[PDB]
Paper text:
αHBs are oligomers of 5 or more α-helical peptides that assemble into coiled-coil structures with central solvent-accessible channels. The αHBs are loaded with an environment sensitive dye (in this case, 1,6-diphenyl-1,3,5-hexatriene, DPH) that binds within the channels and fluoresces.
Despite the requirements for aliphatic residues at a and d, up to 40% of these can be changed to other side chains without compromising barrel integrity. The eleven Group II peptides comprised: single mutants to Cys, His, Asn, Ser or Thr at d sites; and double mutations to His, Asn, Ser or Thr at consecutive a and d sites. Finally, one third of the designs were crystallized and yielded 12 X-ray crystal structures, all of which were open αHBs with fully accessible channels.
Author numbering:
A (entry chain A), B (entry chain B), C (entry chain A), D (entry chain B), E (entry chain A), F (entry chain B), ...: 1 to 29
Write the structure that this text describes.
Protein backbone atom coordinates (compact mmCIF):
# COMPACT_ATOMS: atom_id res chain seq x y z
CA UNK A 1 0.00 0.00 0.00
CA UNK A 2 0.93 3.65 -0.61
CA UNK A 3 1.07 4.64 3.12
CA UNK A 4 3.32 1.68 4.00
CA UNK A 5 5.55 2.57 1.00
CA UNK A 6 5.82 6.22 2.14
CA UNK A 7 6.71 5.12 5.74
CA UNK A 8 9.45 2.87 4.24
CA UNK A 9 10.81 5.97 2.40
CA UNK A 10 10.92 7.77 5.80
CA UNK A 11 12.89 4.81 7.26
CA UNK A 12 15.36 4.98 4.31
CA UNK A 13 15.83 8.75 4.89
CA UNK A 14 16.50 8.13 8.62
CA UNK A 15 19.18 5.54 7.56
CA UNK A 16 20.75 8.32 5.40
CA UNK A 17 20.86 10.53 8.55
CA UNK A 18 22.59 7.66 10.44
CA UNK A 19 25.19 7.30 7.62
CA UNK A 20 25.89 11.07 7.70
CA UNK A 21 26.39 10.92 11.51
CA UNK A 22 28.78 7.90 11.10
CA UNK A 23 30.83 10.05 8.73
CA UNK A 24 30.93 12.83 11.40
CA UNK A 25 32.26 10.25 13.94
CA UNK A 26 35.06 9.33 11.43
CA UNK A 27 35.86 13.10 10.99
CA UNK A 28 36.11 13.59 14.83
CA UNK A 29 38.56 10.60 15.11
CA UNK B 1 -3.27 9.93 -2.28
CA UNK B 2 -2.61 13.23 -0.46
CA UNK B 3 -1.49 11.60 2.85
CA UNK B 4 1.04 9.34 1.09
CA UNK B 5 2.26 12.39 -0.88
CA UNK B 6 2.72 14.46 2.31
CA UNK B 7 4.66 11.57 3.97
CA UNK B 8 6.92 11.45 0.87
CA UNK B 9 7.58 15.23 1.36
CA UNK B 10 8.60 14.43 4.98
CA UNK B 11 11.01 11.73 3.67
CA UNK B 12 12.53 14.25 1.20
CA UNK B 13 13.01 16.81 4.03
CA UNK B 14 14.75 14.13 6.19
CA UNK B 15 17.11 13.41 3.21
CA UNK B 16 17.90 17.18 3.16
CA UNK B 17 18.85 16.90 6.87
CA UNK B 18 21.19 13.97 5.99
CA UNK B 19 22.81 16.06 3.17
CA UNK B 20 23.37 18.97 5.61
CA UNK B 21 24.98 16.62 8.18
CA UNK B 22 27.32 15.24 5.44
CA UNK B 23 28.43 18.85 4.81
CA UNK B 24 29.36 19.09 8.55
CA UNK B 25 31.42 15.83 8.34
CA UNK B 26 33.30 17.26 5.29
CA UNK B 27 33.89 20.59 7.13
CA UNK B 28 35.43 18.64 10.12
CA UNK B 29 37.72 16.61 7.72
CA UNK C 1 -7.38 18.01 3.39
CA UNK C 2 -6.40 19.42 6.80
CA UNK C 3 -4.24 16.41 7.86
CA UNK C 4 -2.28 16.41 4.58
CA UNK C 5 -1.80 20.20 4.97
CA UNK C 6 -0.49 19.79 8.54
CA UNK C 7 1.95 17.01 7.42
CA UNK C 8 3.20 19.40 4.67
CA UNK C 9 3.85 22.02 7.42
CA UNK C 10 5.92 19.36 9.28
CA UNK C 11 7.93 18.74 6.07
CA UNK C 12 8.55 22.52 5.70
CA UNK C 13 9.76 22.70 9.35
CA UNK C 14 12.15 19.76 8.74
CA UNK C 15 13.52 21.69 5.68
CA UNK C 16 14.14 24.66 8.07
CA UNK C 17 16.14 22.26 10.33
CA UNK C 18 18.18 21.16 7.26
CA UNK C 19 18.90 24.84 6.35
CA UNK C 20 20.05 25.56 9.94
CA UNK C 21 22.40 22.52 9.82
CA UNK C 22 23.81 23.69 6.41
CA UNK C 23 24.64 27.01 8.09
CA UNK C 24 26.45 25.09 10.89
CA UNK C 25 28.54 23.26 8.20
CA UNK C 26 29.51 26.71 6.72
CA UNK C 27 30.47 27.93 10.27
CA UNK C 28 32.71 24.81 10.84
CA UNK C 29 34.53 25.43 7.46
CA UNK D 1 -9.96 19.51 13.66
CA UNK D 2 -8.03 18.67 16.85
CA UNK D 3 -5.60 16.18 15.15
CA UNK D 4 -4.66 18.69 12.43
CA UNK D 5 -4.22 21.35 15.15
CA UNK D 6 -1.91 19.08 17.21
CA UNK D 7 0.18 18.27 14.08
CA UNK D 8 0.51 22.05 13.45
CA UNK D 9 1.83 22.41 17.06
CA UNK D 10 4.44 19.70 16.22
CA UNK D 11 5.45 21.71 13.09
CA UNK D 12 5.82 24.88 15.22
CA UNK D 13 8.02 22.99 17.74
CA UNK D 14 10.24 21.68 14.87
CA UNK D 15 10.62 25.33 13.65
CA UNK D 16 11.78 26.22 17.21
CA UNK D 17 14.44 23.46 16.89
CA UNK D 18 15.58 25.04 13.56
CA UNK D 19 15.80 28.51 15.25
CA UNK D 20 17.92 27.03 18.08
CA UNK D 21 20.28 25.35 15.57
CA UNK D 22 20.68 28.70 13.71
CA UNK D 23 21.79 30.23 17.04
CA UNK D 24 24.53 27.50 17.23
CA UNK D 25 25.72 28.33 13.65
CA UNK D 26 25.96 32.05 14.63
CA UNK D 27 27.85 31.15 17.86
CA UNK D 28 30.43 29.12 15.77
CA UNK D 29 30.87 32.08 13.29
CA UNK E 1 -9.46 13.55 22.52
CA UNK E 2 -6.70 11.28 23.85
CA UNK E 3 -4.74 11.07 20.53
CA UNK E 4 -4.74 14.87 20.09
CA UNK E 5 -3.62 15.23 23.74
CA UNK E 6 -0.74 12.76 23.22
CA UNK E 7 0.38 14.60 20.01
CA UNK E 8 0.37 17.87 22.05
CA UNK E 9 2.67 16.14 24.61
CA UNK E 10 5.02 15.26 21.68
CA UNK E 11 5.01 18.94 20.61
CA UNK E 12 5.86 20.01 24.21
CA UNK E 13 8.77 17.50 24.29
CA UNK E 14 10.09 18.86 20.95
CA UNK E 15 9.96 22.40 22.51
CA UNK E 16 12.11 21.01 25.40
CA UNK E 17 14.63 19.78 22.76
CA UNK E 18 14.65 23.30 21.21
CA UNK E 19 15.30 24.87 24.67
CA UNK E 20 18.20 22.45 25.29
CA UNK E 21 19.72 23.35 21.89
CA UNK E 22 19.34 27.12 22.68
CA UNK E 23 21.36 26.49 25.85
CA UNK E 24 24.07 24.75 23.73
CA UNK E 25 24.22 27.89 21.48
CA UNK E 26 24.76 30.05 24.64
CA UNK E 27 27.55 27.62 25.79
CA UNK E 28 29.31 27.88 22.34
CA UNK E 29 29.22 31.75 22.52
CA UNK F 1 -6.21 3.62 24.79
CA UNK F 2 -3.06 1.73 23.72
CA UNK F 3 -2.21 4.10 20.79
CA UNK F 4 -2.45 7.21 23.00
CA UNK F 5 -0.32 5.41 25.62
CA UNK F 6 2.37 4.52 23.06
CA UNK F 7 2.44 8.15 21.79
CA UNK F 8 2.92 9.29 25.42
CA UNK F 9 5.93 6.89 25.66
CA UNK F 10 7.35 8.59 22.50
CA UNK F 11 6.89 12.02 24.20
CA UNK F 12 8.72 10.75 27.32
CA UNK F 13 11.62 9.46 25.15
CA UNK F 14 11.86 12.87 23.38
CA UNK F 15 12.06 14.54 26.86
CA UNK F 16 14.98 12.16 27.64
CA UNK F 17 16.70 13.44 24.46
CA UNK F 18 16.19 17.05 25.70
CA UNK F 19 17.71 16.12 29.12
CA UNK F 20 20.75 14.56 27.39
CA UNK F 21 21.25 17.70 25.23
CA UNK F 22 21.09 19.89 28.40
CA UNK F 23 23.94 17.76 29.81
CA UNK F 24 25.99 18.63 26.65
CA UNK F 25 25.30 22.40 27.13
CA UNK F 26 26.50 22.12 30.78
CA UNK F 27 29.63 20.17 29.66
CA UNK F 28 30.48 23.01 27.14
CA UNK F 29 29.99 25.71 29.90
CA UNK G 1 -2.08 -4.45 19.13
CA UNK G 2 0.63 -4.49 16.44
CA UNK G 3 0.58 -0.69 15.79
CA UNK G 4 0.86 0.14 19.51
CA UNK G 5 3.73 -2.41 19.78
CA UNK G 6 5.57 -0.82 16.82
CA UNK G 7 5.14 2.71 18.33
CA UNK G 8 6.62 1.34 21.62
CA UNK G 9 9.64 0.08 19.59
CA UNK G 10 10.02 3.66 18.21
CA UNK G 11 9.97 5.02 21.80
CA UNK G 12 12.67 2.47 22.82
CA UNK G 13 14.85 3.55 19.83
CA UNK G 14 14.45 7.24 20.83
CA UNK G 15 15.62 6.25 24.39
CA UNK G 16 18.72 4.67 22.73
CA UNK G 17 19.35 8.05 20.99
CA UNK G 18 19.06 9.80 24.40
CA UNK G 19 21.59 7.33 25.94
CA UNK G 20 24.04 7.96 23.06
CA UNK G 21 23.72 11.75 23.57
CA UNK G 22 24.32 11.32 27.37
CA UNK G 23 27.55 9.53 26.50
CA UNK G 24 28.54 12.49 24.24
CA UNK G 25 27.94 14.87 27.22
CA UNK G 26 30.31 12.67 29.35
CA UNK G 27 32.94 12.79 26.51
CA UNK G 28 32.71 16.66 26.33
CA UNK G 29 33.26 16.92 30.17
CA UNK H 1 0.48 -5.97 8.85
CA UNK H 2 2.36 -3.70 6.40
CA UNK H 3 1.91 -0.48 8.49
CA UNK H 4 3.26 -2.14 11.66
CA UNK H 5 6.15 -3.55 9.60
CA UNK H 6 7.01 -0.10 8.16
CA UNK H 7 6.92 1.45 11.68
CA UNK H 8 9.33 -1.30 12.84
CA UNK H 9 11.68 -0.29 9.95
CA UNK H 10 11.51 3.33 11.27
CA UNK H 11 12.45 2.04 14.78
CA UNK H 12 15.43 0.12 13.31
CA UNK H 13 16.61 3.27 11.45
CA UNK H 14 16.37 5.32 14.70
CA UNK H 15 18.54 2.62 16.43
CA UNK H 16 21.10 3.12 13.59
CA UNK H 17 21.11 6.87 14.44
CA UNK H 18 21.80 5.97 18.12
CA UNK H 19 24.71 3.67 17.05
CA UNK H 20 26.20 6.49 14.92
CA UNK H 21 25.95 8.97 17.85
CA UNK H 22 27.73 6.42 20.13
CA UNK H 23 30.58 6.38 17.58
CA UNK H 24 30.83 10.22 17.97
CA UNK H 25 31.00 9.90 21.81
CA UNK H 26 33.84 7.33 21.44
CA UNK H 27 35.67 9.61 18.94
CA UNK H 28 35.49 12.54 21.50
CA UNK H 29 36.85 10.24 24.33
Amino acid sequence: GEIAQALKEIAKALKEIAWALKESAQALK
